[PDB]
Structure formats: structure tokens, C-alpha cells
Design a protein around this ligand. Structure first.
Ligand SMILES: O[C@@H]1[C@@H](O)[C@H](O[C@@H]2CO[C@@H](O[C@@H]3CO[C@H](O)[C@H](O)[C@H]3O)[C@H](O)[C@H]2O)OC[C@H]1O
Ligand SMILES: O[C@@H]1[C@@H](O)[C@H](O[C@@H]2CO[C@@H](O)[C@H](O)[C@H]2O)OC[C@H]1O
Length: 389
């Protein structure tokens, strides 16, 4: 009989949401039906609340983003946009660690690059897409195939130019949440003032690298978003592999509880290793996401809770401040069942519904949990995720 405690009085980060990437230039756009599967929150829908899109370097491509972005917004999502390269007339080449022909933004074009970003913001606004945020650069520190920014180039842009962007500014979107890319911004008062959202990717980011003390120190009034990952691999036709898919839930748990992230955004929504399969159905990896996205809605607040109450069991909890209700997401990676007494002191809640995913069922509604006082005794099937609501 393991125990856990959920402390509804110890509020952590406010949840902004969950979602993934659309890229209708590199791959096919989501279809009408796939837009609904991704951003609706009905039966057989993922309940995503964040769409990420790219800012094409060629403005003649911008129209390709509109249908999916508009539909996501109609269904209640917010949209964030990231550039990979500036327009070619703003780029120059340089040699980086002996590798020639690498791209950077010309320093003398920083003002023009702001205008490019602002033009994108205005174009999208004119088409019913009020962007929540725009990034300086996708993966400035992993730009073999796009545009590099050193930590200092990123800093100088954030300090000197980002205040001119007509949107919330996201930076720096390091590929692995490398703190050398973001520390300069947090330490410079002008750059920090111009920041709105600290964005990070999770490729190869270990749990020990998910906390960020400097952001805890300096980041008041800034959001913290995990804007791209796939886990645990991008193997072809892997999205239903079990128990590998449990790594998706675990990574989300870790982002939330170890990283204090307010948003978790996958790479391509529709892909053979993604949350939606090429046939338009939800994969096992997608149901992992859905355990969070369908239930932990924007504006819920994470609360302190025993994160790992017994070996191979992981727990997160979020509160709806409208009525102090609780959503708990509990991962059991063990090959045996686990029984846990979850204490929720001070709650007036006395019953939880539960939905369970395993290798053989998806979001199956199982028997209700009736509390004895403020303690909810739950039994977790082997190799499962359960959301309690
Ligand atoms: O020239 C273009 C290529 O650059 C492009 O290759 C893609 C580059 O992006 C990789 O996706 C990355 C996945 O990991 C993180 O989320 C990255 O930031 C993404 O950019 C893709 O796997 C490549 O296919 O292909 C299109 C071509 O026009
Ligand atoms: O798609 C790209 C990934 O392939 C890349 O993967 C990471 C590279 O660094 C390693 O230390 C990590 O283990 C690995 O996941 O991340 C960047 C992304 O653009």
C-alpha cells in the first residue's frame, strides 16, 4: 500500500495546453477531418489546445497555413509560429566549426527580420488567426539545415530588436533545452523584458536537465513552453508500439512536474510515429497525450503532488480553480498492478471517474473511485495510464 498526497494549496504552473505541429509545405496539411480529430475534444478526438506552425521564408507560402490554423482556433486552440530561415535576401553564409556555407541572419538585417515576422503576424490576423506568439528561431543551436544563432546573436536580437515584434515573443527554442541559449536573455533586463515565452525543445533532454533554476529566479511573468519533441524515437510505423508508447506519457509527466512546463507540443501531429497515424486514427502515442490533453484543460493549475509514489508509478495533478476539482494522471510502467492510497487533504470531492489506456484498450472508462474521507484508493493495471477526473 503505497501512498501519495495531492496538495491543492501548493499551486505550481498554470497550464497553457498541449498539441503538435502542422507543416503543409514540408508534408501534407491536415485534412478537414484530421483538424477535427486533433483539436476537437469529443469522442475519438485528441483535445489538443495548441497548434504550432512555421513562418515560411517565402511569403507566397503563408496562405497554406490558414485553413488548419483557423480551424484549430475555431475549436478553441491557440497558435504559435516559429521560423526556420529568414528570407534569403537577409541571410549570409559563414563557416561554423569548420563546416562551410552555414546560414545566419545578417546583423544589418535584424530590423528587416522584425518586419518579416510582423508581416506574418499581420497576414495571419487578416485571415482570422490571431497568433498567441511568434519565435525568433526554431533550434538556433541545431541549424545544420536552417539558420544558426549563437547565444550572443540571440541575446542581441532579444535585447535590441525583439521589442519591435507585434506579438508575444518566444525564444530561444533550443533543440535540447540547452541553458547556454537562454541564460543570456534571463540575465539581461532589456532582453528579458522583450521575452514573453521561454520556449524549449526536448530532443535528448534528460530529467536532470528539465529543472531551470535561473528561470525560477528571473522568469516572473514569463511563460514556459516545451514546443517540440518526439519520443522515444521516430521509427517508421512505431506509433502503436507497446509498452514503448508509455515513454510519451512519462516525458509529459516529466515536462510538467520536473520542468514546470505550461505547454507540451509534439512534432508533426500526423505521422507514422506521431499522435495521429497516417490513416487519421489516434495512435497509442496519441492516447498517451490525450490522457493529459483531453482532461487537463487550459487554465487548470498544476499542484504539488507526490510525483513517484512507488517504483515505476508516476503521478501529476492539476486543479480547476472554478470548482477546485482535480485531474490526476497516473502512469504505471510496472508489469504488475499497483494499489495506491491517494490523499487529497481538504478536498470536498468524493468521487473520481477514471479512464484507462493499456496495450489492449484506449481511454476505457472503468469503475468509479469512491473516496473514504479525503483518501482515494486506486488500483493501476500493469503498463497503463489512468486519468482520474
Ligand atoms: O530542405 C528541407 C529540409 O530541411 C527538410 O528536412 C526536415 C528538417 O526538419 C526535420 O524535422 C526536425 C524534427 O526535429 C525537430 O522538431 C526539428 O526542429 C525539425 O525541423 C525533418 O525530419 C526533416 O524532414 O525536409 C524538407 C526540405 O524542403
Ligand atoms: O530531428 C532532430 C533530432 O534528430 C535531434 O536529435 C537529438 C540530437 O542530439 C542528441 O544528443 C539527442 O540524443 C537527439 O535526440 O534533435 C534535434 C532535431 O532537430
Amino acid at each position: 500500500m503505497a501512498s501519495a498526497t495531492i496538495n491543492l494549496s501548493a499551486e505550481k504552473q498554470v497550464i497553457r495546453g498541449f498539441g503538435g505541429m502542422n507543416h503543409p509545405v514540408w508534408i501534407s496539411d491536415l485534412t478537414p477531418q484530421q483538424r477535427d480529430t486533433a483539436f476537437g475534444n469529443g469522442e475519438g478526438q485528441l483535445g489538443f489546445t495548441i497548434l504550432r506552425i512555421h513562418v515560411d521564408e517565402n511569403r507566397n507560402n503563408w496562405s497554406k497555413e490558414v485553413a488548419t490554423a483557423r480551424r484549430a482556433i475555431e475549436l478553441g486552440a491557440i497558435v504559435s509560429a516559429s521560423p526556420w530561415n529568414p528570407p534569403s535576401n537577409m541571410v549570409e553564409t559563414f563557416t561554423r566549426n569548420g563546416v562551410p556555407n552555414q546560414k545566419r541572419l545578417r546583423y544589418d538585417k535584424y530590423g528587416d527580420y522584425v518586419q518579416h515576422l510582423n508581416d506574418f503576424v499581420a497576414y495571419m490576423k487578416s485571415n482570422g488567426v490571431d497568433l498567441y506568439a511568434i519565435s525568433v528561431q526554431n533550434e538556433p543551436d541545431y541549424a545544420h539545415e536552417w539558420t544558426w544563432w549563437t547565444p550572443q546573436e540571440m541575446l542581441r536580437f532579444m535585447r535590441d530588436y525583439a521589442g519591435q515584434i507585434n506579438c508575444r515573443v518566444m525564444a530561444p527554442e533550443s533543440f535540447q533545452y540547452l541553458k547556454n541559449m537562454s541564460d543570456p536573455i534571463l540575465n539581461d533586463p532589456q532582453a528579458l523584458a522583450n521575452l514573453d515565452i521561454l520556449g524549449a525543445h526536448f530532443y535528448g533532454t534528460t530529467v536532470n536537465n528539465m529543472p531551470y533554476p535561473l528561470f525560477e529566479q528571473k522568469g516572473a511573468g514569463k511563460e514556459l513552453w516545451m514546443t517540440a519533441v518526439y519520443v522515444p524515437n521516430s521509427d517508421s510505423n512505431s506509433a502503436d508500439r507497446w509498452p514503448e508508447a508509455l515513454e510519451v506519457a512519462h516525458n509529459m509527466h516529466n515536462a510538467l512536474v520536473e520542468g514546470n512546463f505550461q505547454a507540451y507540443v509534439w512534432w508533426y501531429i500526423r505521422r507514422s510515429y506521431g499522435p495521429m497515424k497516417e490513416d487519421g486514427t489516434i495512435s497509442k502515442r496519441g492516447y498517451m497525450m490525450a490522457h493529459y490533453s483531453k482532461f487537463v484543460r487550459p487554465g487548470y493549475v498544476r499542484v504539488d503532488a507526490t510525483k513517484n509514489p512507488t517504483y515505476n508509478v508516476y503521478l501529476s495533478a492539476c486543479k480547476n480553480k472554478k470548482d477546485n476539482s482535480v485531474v490526476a494522471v497516473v502512469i504505471n510502467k510496472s508489469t504488475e498492478a499497483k494499489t495506491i492510497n491517494i490523499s487529497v487533504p481538504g478536498t470536498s470531492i468524493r468521487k473520481w471517474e477514471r479512464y484507462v489506456t493499456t496495450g489492449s484498450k484506449n481511454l476505457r472508462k472503468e469503475s468509479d473511485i469512491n473516496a473514504s474521507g479525503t483518501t482515494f484508493q486506486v488500483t493501476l493495471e500493469p503498463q497503463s495510464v489512468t486519468t482520474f477526473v
